[PDB]
C-alpha cells in the first residue's frame, strides 16, 4: 500500500529529523575535481572520496555569505532535511561537516547533467519523455509532502539526470518542514505560484503549481509565463491566462489547466483527493507508478558517459579556491549544522 509505505517512511524520517547527523567527514578526505554549478546561493563541486574512491557532489556554502543573504535558517533547513530523507529521486546527505569558513554537504553524484541543459539543447521533450520525468516529481512530492516538507524550488536547473536516465531533485535551499501556512517570498520567478507573488500565506500547493510550470516547459520548450524582467512575469502569472502550443495533447492541456489553477479550491494536488487527482488523470494513464518508483521503466533518454567522474554533461565554470580562514566565522549561527 502507498499509505503504509509512507507511514514507515515517516517513521524513518522523524528519527533522523529529531537527531540529526553532524560532523561525519572532513574536507581533507575529498579530492576536489570540478565545479558543477555556482551562484550567489553557493556552489556544487564534484569531489572524490579518497577512502572509497566514490564520487560525490559536494555543496559548499560560505557562512559569511549565507548570513549576508539572510539564509541562515534556510540553510539549517536544507541540511536537517536532506540528512533525514531517503527516496529514489532524492540525494540524501552521505556526509556533512563545517570548518572555520564554509558548510559542506556531500551527496550522490548524478553524472547525466541538469535537465535544463538537455531541455535547452534538444528544444522540447515529447509528451512521453516529459511524462516520464513528471511521474518522478509527482512521487517525490507525495513523499516530501507526507513528511510535512515543502520543496519550493522546482525547475529543470535543479533536476539532475543519473546514469540510468532517472532524475534527482536537488537543491533544498528553500525546503521547509511546516504544518500549515508559511509566508517566505522565495523560489524562481517563472515557477512562483500566484499566492506567493501576492504575499499570501501559502502551503504545499505551490509545489503543485510549480509542477504545472515544469510540465509545460518540458513539453513546450519554454515556460508558460516568460518576459525579460521578473515583474512582467509576475503580471502574467496572476493574470489567470495561459496559452498552450497547438501540439499539446487534449489530456496535457487539461492536466495543466488544473495544475496552473490560480484558485486553490480547484488546484490539483490541493483538493480533498490530494495527489491522486494527478496520479489518476488521463495524461498519466500509461504510467505504472510502482514501476517508476522501482526504476524498471526504460528511460526515454540515457546520458552519454565515458567513465566514472565524467563531467562532460555539465558546463564549465570558473574554478575558485576553497579558502579556510584561521578564524572561526559565524560559529553560533551554524552551531547545529
Amino acid at each position: 500500500s502507498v499509505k503504509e509505505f509512507l507511514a514507515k517512511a515517516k517513521e524513518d524520517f522523524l528519527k533522523k529529523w529529531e537527531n540529526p547527523a553532524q560532523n561525519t567527514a572532513h574536507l581533507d578526505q575529498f579530492e576536489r575535481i570540478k565545479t558543477l554549478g555556482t551562484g550567489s546561493f553557493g556552489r556544487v563541486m564534484l569531489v572524490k572520496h579518497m577512502e572509497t574512491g566514490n564520487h560525490y557532489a559536494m555543496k559548499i556554502l560560505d557562512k559569511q555569505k549565507v548570513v549576508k543573504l539572510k539564509q541562515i535558517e534556510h540553510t539549517l533547513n536544507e541540511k536537517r532535511i536532506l540528512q533525514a530523507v531517503n527516496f529514489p529521486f532524492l540525494t540524501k546527505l552521505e556526509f556533512s561537516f563545517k570548518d572555520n569558513s564554509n558548510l559542506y554537504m556531500v551527496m550522490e553524484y548524478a553524472p547525466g547533467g541538469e535537465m535544463f541543459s538537455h531541455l535547452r539543447r534538444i528544444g522540447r521533450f515529447s509528451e512521453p519523455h516529459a511524462r516520464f520525468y513528471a511521474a518522478q516529481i509527482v512521487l517525490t512530492f507525495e513523499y516530501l509532502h507526507s513528511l510535512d516538507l515543502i520543496y519550493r524550488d522546482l525547475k529543470p536547473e535543479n533536476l539532475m539526470i543519473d546514469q540510468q536516465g532517472y532524475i534527482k531533485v536537488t537543491d533544498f535551499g528553500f525546503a521547509k518542514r511546516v504544518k500549515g501556512r508559511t509566508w517566505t517570498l522565495c523560489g524562481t520567478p517563472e515557477y512562483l505560484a500566484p499566492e506567493i507573488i501576492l504575499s499570501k500565506g501559502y502551503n504545499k500547493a505551490v509545489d503543485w503549481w510549480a509542477l504545472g510550470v515544469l510540465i509545460y516547459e518540458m513539453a513546450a520548450g519554454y515556460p508558460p509565463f516568460f518576459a525579460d524582467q521578473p515583474i512582467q512575469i509576475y503580471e502574467k502569472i496572476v493574470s489567470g491566462k495561459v496559452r498552450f502550443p497547438s501540439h499539446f495533447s487534449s489530456d496535457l492541456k487539461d492536466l495543466l489547466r488544473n495544475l496552473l489553477q490560480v484558485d486553490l479550491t480547484k488546484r490539483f494536488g490541493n483538493l480533498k483527493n490530494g495527489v491522486n487527482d494527478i496520479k489518476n488523470h488521463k495524461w498519466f494513464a500509461t504510467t505504472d507508478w510502482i514501476a517508476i518508483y522501482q526504476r524498471k521503466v526504460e528511460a526515454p533518454f540515457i546520458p552519454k558517459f565515458k567513465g566514472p567522474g565524467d563531467t562532460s554533461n555539465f558546463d564549465d565554470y570558473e574554478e575558485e579556491e576553497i579558502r579556510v580562514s584561521i578564524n572561526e566565522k559565524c560559529g553560533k549561527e551554524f552551531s547545529e549544522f
Binding site: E157, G173, C186, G187, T188
Partner: peptide
C-alpha cells in the same frame, strides 16, 4: 512565434532564485 520570442529573451539561461 512564441519559441522565437523565448529564444530572443534574456531568460533562456539558468535562472536564479529570488528573495527579499
Amino acid at each position: 512565434t512564441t519559441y522565437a520570442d523565448f529564444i530572443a529573451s534574456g531568460r533562456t539561461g539558468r535562472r536564479n532564485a529570488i528573495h527579499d
